Structure 1
Amino acid sequence: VVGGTDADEGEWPWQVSLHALGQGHICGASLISPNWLVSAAHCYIDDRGFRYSDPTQWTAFLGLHDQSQRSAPGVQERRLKRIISHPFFNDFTFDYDIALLELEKPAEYSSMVRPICLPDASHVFPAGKAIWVTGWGHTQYGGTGALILQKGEIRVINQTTCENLLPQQITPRMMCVGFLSGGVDSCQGDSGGPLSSVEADGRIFQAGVVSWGDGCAQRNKPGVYTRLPLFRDWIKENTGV
C-alpha cells in the first residue's frame, strides 16, 4: 500500500497473508467464513520455477500484524485444501481475477480473526464512496514490502472514467478505486487482499479484490479491483457461504 499508515493491531481481522513455501508473503486474502477465503486468481498460477497453483504449496496466516512476528499470540496458521480459480479468469486481461481458497482446518474466530461481510448480488458501491485498502505489499512502486499491515483510504471511481483512463483494459468485472491525482494506492503483494467498505450501521463489507494497476499511486493510474457483488452467487455455489 502506497501512501497509507500502520494499521492498529487487529483492525482488519479479515485480512489474511498467503505465503508460498520458502518465499514469504505473496498475496493477500480475506476471511469470509470459518473455512473459506477470497483472493485473486492471478496469485495461483504456475511459473517455470514454482507451482503457485498447488494448494499444498501455501500457508495462510490469519490475525497477522507483523510479517516478522508470525508466531505472535492470536496469529493462526492454516494450510489449504483447495484453490478454486474462477473458470473465466483470463491471464492476459486479468478478467475474472478471483479465487476461493479452502482452509485445511477451520479458522477460530477471535478478536483478531473474524470474517468480512459479503455484499448481496444487487448491491452497488457507488462512485465517490470512501473505502479502505490494506496489505503487506510494496509501499512504493519498485519499493519493499511493509512489515506492519498498512491501511489507506481510497474512493470508488466512475466506471466510464475508469475505462477511459485505461483504454481497452477495463471489463465490467473490474472497478477503479483510488484518486486520479495518485498518492494512495495498493501495490505489488497487496494483490488478493480485500477492499473494506464501512456500510450503514458501521459493519465492513468486501467491496473488491486487489487485482492490478499500472505502477502504483501514479497520476491517472488508479488501482483496478475485482468487484464482489457480481460473484455473490458464484461464492455461494462453490462454498456454501
Structure 2
Amino acid sequence: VVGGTDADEGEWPWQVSLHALGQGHICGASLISPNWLVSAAHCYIDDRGFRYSDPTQWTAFLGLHDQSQRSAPGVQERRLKRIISHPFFNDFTFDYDIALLELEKPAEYSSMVRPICLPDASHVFPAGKAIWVTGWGHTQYGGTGALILQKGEIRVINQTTCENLLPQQITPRMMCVGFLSGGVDSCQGDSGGPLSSVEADGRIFQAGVVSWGDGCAQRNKPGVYTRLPLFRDWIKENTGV
C-alpha cells in the first residue's frame, strides 16, 4: 500500500497473509468462513522455478500484524487443502482474477481472526464511495514490502472513466478504486487482499480483490480490483458459503 498508515492490531481481522514455502509473504487473502479464503488467481500461477498452483506450497497466516512476528499471540498458521481458480481467469488480461482457498483445518474465530461479510449479487458499491485497501505489499512502486500491515483509504471510480484511463484493458469484472491524482494505491504484494467497505450499520463488506495496476500511485493510474458481487453465486456454489 502506497500512501497508507500502519493498521492497528486486529483492525482488519479478515486480512490474511499467504506465504509460499521459502519465499515469505507473496499475496493477501480474506477470510470468508471458517474454511475458506478469497484471493487473486494470478497469485497461484507456476513459473519455471516454483509451482505456485500447488496448494501444498503455501501457508496462510490469520491474525497477523507484523511479518517479523508470525508466532505472536493470536496469530494462526494454516495450510491449504485446495486452490479453486476461477475457470474463466485469463493470465494475459487478468479477467476473472479471483480464487478460493480451502484451509486444511478451520480458522478459530477470535478478536484477531474474523470473517469479512460478502455482498449480495445485486449490491452496487457506488462511484465515489470511500473504501479501504490493506496489505503488506510495497509502500512505493519498486520499493519494499511493509513489515506492519498498512491501510489506505481510496474511492470507487466511475467505470467509463476507468475504461478510458486504461484503454482495452478494463473488463466488467474489474473496478478502478483510488484517486486520479494518485497518492494512495495498492502495490506489489497487496494482490489477493480485500477491499473493505463500511456499510450502513458499520459492518464491513468485501467490495473487491486487489488485482493489478500500471505502476503504483501514479496520476491517472488508479489500481484495478476484481468486483465481488458478481461472484457471490460462484462462491456459494463452490464453498457452500
1:133-161 deviation per Cα after TM superposition (whole angstroms, max 9, x unaligned): 00000000000000000000000000000
Structure 2 distance, partners of 1:74, 1:102, is: 20
Q: For 2:121, what is the secondary structure of its paired residue?
A: coil
- Flag as ranges the 4+ runs of structure 1 deviating above 3 A: none
CA deviation profile, 1:87-127 (whole Å, cap 9, x unmatched)? 00000000000000000000000000000000000000000
Q: Deviations over 1:41-90 (max 9, x none)?
A: 00001000000000000000000000000000000000000000000000
Q: Secondary structure at the match of 1:88?
A: coil
Q: 1:133, 1:91 → 2: CA distance?
A: 23
Residues 206-240 of structure 1 deviation map (CA, whole Å, 9 limit, x = unaligned): 00000000000000000000000000000000000
Give the Cα separation in 2 of the matches to 1:77 and 1:222: 33
Give the fraction of aligned pairs with identical amino acids, expressed as a percent: 100
Q: Partners in 2 of 1:231 and 1:240 — Cα distance?
A: 13
CA distance in structure 2 between the aligned counterparts of 1:223 and 1:229, rounded to whole angstroms: 18
Match of 1:117 in 2: 117
Q: CA deviation at 1:28?
A: 0.2
Write the distance in 2 (CA, Å) between the matches of 1:117 and 1:153. 19
Q: How does 1:72-221 map to 2 (within 5 A)?
A: 72-221=72-221
Query: Normalization by structure 1: what TM-score?
Result: 1.00
Partners of 2:201 and 2:78 lie apart in 1 by 32
Q: Secondary structure at the match of 1:106?
A: coil
* Corresponding position: 1:49 with 2:49: yes
The aligned runs of 1:7-26 (5 Å cut-off) are 7-26=7-26
- Residue 19 of structure 1 deviates from its aligned partner by 0.0
| Structure 1: gaps of 5 or more residues | none
Cα distance, 1:167 vs structure 2: 0.2
For residues 223 and 124 of structure 2, what CA distance do their matches in structure 1 show?
18
RMSD: 0.2
- In structure 2, the residue matched to 1:58 is 58
TM-score, normalising length: structure 2:
1.00
The equivalent residue for 1:5 is 5
Matches of 2:145 and 2:208 in 1, distance apart? Answer: 21
Quote the offset at 1:132 in angstroms. Answer: 0.1
User: What is the rounded CA distance, in whole Å, between the counterparts of 2:186 and 2:45 in structure 1?
Assistant: 21
The separation in 1 between residues aligned to 2:32 and 2:217, in whole angstroms, is 28
